[PDB]
């Protein structure tokens, strides 16, 4: 995990950015994840948060797509927090609803079962924890190299 300065400081840049991707801002064609995302949303819906300028969108656009795209169900669950800003325990609710059986080692021995809520929302937790991990020093670098240069 990030340590907690890094993290309020990634998770308030994904919060500008998730609000510049709802707004519609993105070109399709620099993530086919986020497209597909924004198409799947309800049109009409009034802004409320404040976003990022289009610089920093593509930007870190570029850096999330670059870093999520090997998984799917978590890219998604990044974009169902910060670009719709669906709470954590409905994306755990969406995944409980939807979650295959499966193959427990339970004390005494295996058995099937679907995931309770608790563990779905515990996943959920893990998986934006994760993904914050592995954007962090490529979205740190980006920033840099970009001052660097420019
Ligand atoms: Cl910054
Ligand atoms: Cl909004
Ligand atoms: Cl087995
Ligand atoms: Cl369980």
Request: charged share 25%; hydrophobic share 40%.
């Amino acid at each position: 995990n990030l340590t907690k300065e890094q993290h309020e400081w990634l998770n308030g840049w994904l919060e500008l950015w998730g609000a510049w991707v709802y707004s519609g801002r993105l070109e399709k064609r620099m993530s086919s994840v986020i497209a597909k995302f924004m198409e799947s949303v309800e049109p009409g819906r009034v802004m409320t948060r404040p976003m990022c300028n289009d610089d920093d969108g593509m930007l870190i656009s570029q850096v999330v797509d670059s870093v999520m795209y090997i998984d799917k169900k978590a890219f998604g669950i990044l974009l169902s927090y910060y670009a719709h800003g669906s709470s954590k325990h409905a994306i755990a609710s969406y995944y409980h609803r939807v979650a295959r059986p499966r193959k427990m080692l339970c004390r005494g021995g295996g058995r099937i079962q679907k995931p309770s809520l608790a563990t779905c929302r515990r996943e959920v937790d893990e998986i934006l924890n994760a993904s914050l991990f592995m954007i962090y020093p490529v979205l740190d670098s980006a920033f840099k190299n970009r001052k660097r240069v420019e």
